[PDB]
């Protein structure tokens with residue numbers, strides 16, 4: 001059960017999360033919970049760790065800038081993080097909030113949530129499941145989600161590669177800064193597209 | 195004159211370059227020579243340094259992999275360079291060939307050619323002129339070259355930002371690895387797009 005990892009039940013979590021997040025964000029988290037489960041089954045990942053990471057992944061999505069900044073200092077994280085924003089922080093810093101609120105200490109789940117947005121050059125299979133589940137969960141309908149879904153049905157590595165290539169492409173298309181760890185992911189996984 | 199910087203005349207250079215490169219690549223270099231001159235005038239860069247860098251920028255475009263690898267060892271360059279290819283090498287490594295063949299020692303011209311493909315987080319105005327001239331020279335006709343040209347008529351910084359955003363976008367669109375120094379450029383210049 002989830003109580004094996006956090007300090008409350010799935011139901012109590014859901015109640016807590018419904019306070020912290022708007023409907024759409026919570027529905028998305030439930031989406032990722034389900035998608036992570038199906039991917040974990042297909043690729044030999046502990047389904048329960050995947051489900052819980054999936055549900056928790058955007059837990060900290062609505063922390064203010066101020067709170068993230070507070071968290072950066074308190075946990076003495078990379079000072080460069082202050083030069084960034086919510087996109088980077090909700091996973092990379094938001095893990096400290098999750099740890100505070102829910103007494104989550106499992107290093108594998110924490111890592112999966114940590115790098116769900118930006119990935120890393122080295123990802124565990126759990127990491128990859130969350131990173132992909134987030135992209136392909138059943139409520140998303142961006143153009144090309146069907147291609148992501150087909151790729152994720154066959155290869156987790158190729159799904160990571162595809163998602164990261166489309167993110168780098170969209171960020172550059174939009175003229176947004178690209179967190180350098182995302183490029184690390186991109187360059188590690190890009191060979192899989194072939 | 196060019197003899198102020200290299201060991202032969204412009205004419206003798208052109209003869210030498212016509213041997214080293216196919217017509218299209220040489221025509222391109224002449225294109226960049228002219229474009230660099232016009233940009234140097236507009237933005238307060240020494241027109242002669244700009245012209246010469248522009249003409250020399252793709253001098254080493256057809257060195258073999260083997261020669262680049264030879265050059266990496268001899269000049270004891272970043273060993274990571276071996277993990278890459280022509281795109282990165284012709285500027286970043288090709289400067290050593292140019293120095294060998296033409297006795298070019300001016301640090302400013304060398305730097306401009308060095309990073310003409312990938313840029314850097316810090317670029318001199320000469321660097322920027324070459325980086326942009328390469329993109330907008332009169333023989334290019336890629337879709338959007340007209341937008342690049344208009345931007346380069348008004349702002350060198352914005353021209354750098356635009357070119358780099360389109361390169362990052364195209365590399366990700368194509369599924370090619372992205373040399374991490376290119377992202378350095380992208381993230382330094384991207385604010386200029388606003």
Ligand SMILES: Nc1ncnc2c1ncn2[C@@H]1O[C@H](COP(=O)(O)O)[C@@H](O)[C@H]1O
Pocket residue numbers: 087088116117118134167171176177178179180181182183
């Ligand atoms: N390296 C990055 N730098 C900045 N934003 C990013 C990066 N990678 C992903 N994002 C964006 O962060 C937002 C949240 O992503 P996600 O956590 O995957 O839903 C999305 O709009 C992504 O485009």
Ligand SMILES: Nc1ncnc2c1ncn2[C@@H]1O[C@H](COP(=O)(O)O)[C@@H](O)[C@H]1O
Pocket residue numbers: 281282310311312328361365370371372373374375376377
């Ligand atoms: N960071 C990079 N990594 C790999 N290739 C690149 C990078 N930046 C530019 N290129 C490519 O290298 C080629 C030569 O570029 P240029 O020297 O600007 O004509 C072009 O096809 C560019 O798309």
Ligand SMILES: [Fe+3]
Pocket residue numbers: 057058090091116117
């Ligand atoms: Fe997220």
Ligand SMILES: [Fe+3]
Pocket residue numbers: 028032057058134
């Ligand atoms: Fe999400």
Ligand SMILES: [Fe+3]
Pocket residue numbers: 251252284285310311
């Ligand atoms: Fe070039």
Ligand SMILES: [Fe+3]
Pocket residue numbers: 222226251252328
């Ligand atoms: Fe060129």
